[PDB]
């Protein structure tokens, strides 16, 4: 029984590997060689959103691409105004051990979570004029690592208990749970259509889940260390992971395999944040070497370095219109980067 | 700036003032981190996050026992990178689980993030270890071959009126932990080993003294004097 099942699993893995090898007629690197290189991406710190008093682990841009929310050990969840460097709100969290934050697509709600194993949803648009926690989503046995909003009523959270959950804010209970990971899930990225999403865990794997079905569709085992960050290609048919072995990777949901690896011999520190550009040609990627590197997503050529931080880059996000890149570091700073023409 | 952009700037200035006040209030407490095993007895030291607040010599201490999350202390130890110190409670009486404790201490010491966080090591369950040594049924030589050729170093400090065998065992355990600690760090962070009898009321005083030494070292580093 157990022996046969352990074997059947091995033969199924071998069949999956053989299918992936058969479908790999070519590679993305050799296909995208005739395209002109993007050049050297020069980016300057337009704004420095200072005011945090501790190390930042999370940020999220609003749908309007002007408001962003940041989380830090200081105990506050500031809603910045990136255009004018203004603190619209400063939400004091019950637990300062916050490693994640989110901004609702409608902009009415924000979320935070961390070592308290609780996702706190805050109502920004209240008639009382203050920000109060509308719902505390408890039910996870591990620290929350990432939380993303589907709409004003649904939010998907990933925790260090090897499970991801889909919540109902109105009710407060897990609508659907996502099991299958064998390590602490450290990031999640919702698809453009929010019908599917991926999660990167510490077992060096990324799993593509379905929010409605609730079952894992595909798995991607190409990394050698913990996946600290995961993003999604703008078209929704690919995603990029960032692991602790200083290499990013670009997996595809259709070919079911890694297309290209974004690594350099000079960089030995792990990736903490990954986000694509609006067109998807550029791959921003934070690194522990106090620097952020811009990777040409089609050629794996470092097109620039966003070296302006005095500590580890922890969070990083590109605006919805692609007009700016905001990087947060452990030096309690938050810098908005924009190209110069 | 407009009239409604000037008022927003004033609101942001008020928000920044409140943030500065909160930071000033929260900077006056020293944060710690309780680490150990199930049998260590970390809860009964000072006598998911289980915060513990105690004050000694008008200095506020905040000990964060991170229970709940239940595996290697990894991927959440990065948050405790600004803590003053790490209290690593270890049961020195159970030799069977001792090697696991040394491995855990080695993993914590060699962490990439806790490369500047000094560890206040407490050799808990001193009375149980003394009783085990006195009984003689359990010998440390069975689990640790190096104990056979180990002898109490000269110029030691056997302040308690205890048998040499108990002192030799305690010094052997402390030496193992110190040798683990001194293999890396290059003096950036150091380990402070102490012995706890599970009834001692001076654990808070020891933590305060070690934190004072750690803060003195940080002040030295801030002066480019070290």
């Amino acid at each position: 029984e157990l022996d046969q099942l352990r074997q059947e699993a091995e033969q199924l893995k071998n069949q999956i590997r053989d299918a992936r090898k058969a479908c790999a007629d070519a590679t993305l690197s050799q296909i995208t060689n005739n395209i002109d290189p993007v050049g050297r991406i020069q980016m300057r710190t337009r704004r420095t959103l200072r005011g945090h008093l501790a190390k930042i682990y999370a940020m999220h841009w609003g749908t309007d691409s002007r408001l962003l929310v940041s989380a830090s050990q200081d105990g506050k969840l500031i809603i910045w105004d990136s255009y004018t460097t203004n603190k619209v709100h400063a939400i004091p969290l019950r637990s300062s051990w916050v490693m994640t934050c989110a901004y609702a697509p409608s902009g009415n709600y924000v979320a935070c979570g961390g070592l308290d194993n609780i996702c706190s949803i805050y109502n920004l648009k209240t008639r009382e004029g203050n920000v109060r926690v509308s719902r505390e989503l408890a039910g996870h046995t591990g620290y929350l690592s990432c939380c993303r909003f589907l709409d004003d009523n649904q939010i998907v959270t990933s925790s260090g208990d090897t499970t991801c959950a889909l919540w109902d804010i109105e009710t407060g209970q897990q609508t659907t749970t996502f099991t299958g990971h064998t390590g602490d899930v450290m990031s999640l990225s919702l698809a453009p259509d929010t019908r599917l999403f991926v999660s990167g865990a510490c077992d060096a794997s990324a799993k593509l889940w379905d929010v409605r079905e609730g079952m894992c569709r595909q798995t991607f085992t190409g990394h050698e260390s913990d996946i600290n960050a995961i993003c999604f290609f703008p078209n929704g048919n690919a995603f990029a992971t960032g692991s602790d072995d200083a290499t990013c990777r670009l997996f595809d949901l259709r070919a079911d395999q890694e297309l290209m690896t974004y690594s350099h011999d000079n960089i030995i520190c792990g990736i903490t944040s990954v986000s694509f550009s609006k067109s998807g040609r550029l791959l921003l990627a934070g690194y522990d070497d106090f620097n952020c590197n811009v990777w040409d997503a089609l050629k794996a050529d470092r097109a620039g370095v966003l070296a302006g931080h005095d500590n580890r880059v922890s969070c990083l996000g590109v605006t919805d219109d692609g007009m700016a890149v905001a990087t947060g570091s452990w030096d309690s700073f938050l810098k908005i980067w924009n190209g110069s023409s | 700036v407009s009239a409604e952009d000037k008022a927003a700037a004033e609101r942001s200035k008020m928000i920044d003032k409140n943030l500065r006040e909160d930071g000033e209030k929260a900077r006056r407490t020293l944060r710690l981190l309780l680490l150990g095993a199930d049998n260590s007895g970390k809860s009964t030291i000072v006598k998911g996050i289980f915060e513990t607040k105690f004050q000694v010599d008008k200095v506020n201490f905040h000990m964060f026992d991170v229970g709940g999350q239940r595996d290697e202390r990894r991927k959440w130890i990065q948050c405790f990178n600004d803590v003053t110190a790490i209290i690593f409670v270890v049961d020195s009486s159970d030799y069977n689980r001792l090697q696991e404790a040394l491995n855990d201490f080695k993993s914590i010491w060699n962490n990439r993030w806790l490369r500047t966080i000094s560890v206040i090591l407490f050799l808990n369950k001193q009375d149980l270890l003394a009783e085990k040594v006195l009984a003689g049924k359990s010998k440390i030589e069975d689990y640790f071959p190096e104990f056979a050729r180990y002898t109490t170093p000269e110029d030691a400090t056997p302040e308690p009126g205890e048998d040499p065998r108990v002192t030799r065992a305690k010094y052997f355990i402390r030496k193992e932990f110190v040798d683990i600690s001194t293999a890396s760090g290059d003096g950036r962070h150091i380990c402070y080993p102490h012995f706890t009898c599970a009834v001692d009321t001076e654990n808070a005083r020891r933590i305060f003294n070690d934190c004072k030494d750690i803060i003195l070292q940080m002040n030295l580093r801030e002066y480019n004097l070290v």
Partner: single-chain antibody
Amino acid sequence: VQLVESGGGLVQPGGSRKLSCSASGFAFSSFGMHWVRQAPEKGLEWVAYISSGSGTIYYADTVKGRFTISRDDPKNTLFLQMTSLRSEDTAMYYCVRSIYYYGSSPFDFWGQGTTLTVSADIVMTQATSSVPVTPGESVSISCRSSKSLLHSNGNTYLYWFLQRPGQSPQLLIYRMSNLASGVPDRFSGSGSGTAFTLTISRLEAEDVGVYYCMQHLEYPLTFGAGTKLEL
């Protein structure tokens, strides 16, 4: 959220009086507070403004020196020390709230009002003052500022308020395009920097009232004479 004001009666000319605005149901310490007077059979006129934390205080040119605004945050009350009461101060005083942050709805809740009976400005122009409109049809009000209210920030700072007969004014639109919460979808704002239009898709018995347009762009805060809607 409820603002109740008291302290207004019959005052001899040249005397002094103090108005108190009791605030409850909201974070009074985070809301900038205005005082708005309305003479009988006349339009709204801005009086004073005190911000959160009492950092900046702005008074109208017809009350500067005579009137002073102060806020007791701990006890949630706003006050106006009205001195040298001239016979032009015989008007109902309202206590409007205003929080200012990207996307805020300034002038959201207007207080109930207190009738006090004393025994370089952007001139908004609501040409029409009487409109015979029957329920079911669409009606469009129309203001016109002297200076363009479109700041470089891209926000046209014109607000549209409707007062039902015998009721405190309620904001319908903020920054011209925006619609206030609790406000029906049919009211709409269409704007040009010097021309502003408010349109209601369907007339309602509740809708009939006097509609006032204000500019928040320069400090003196003016309100258009208003356009009474006749059923």
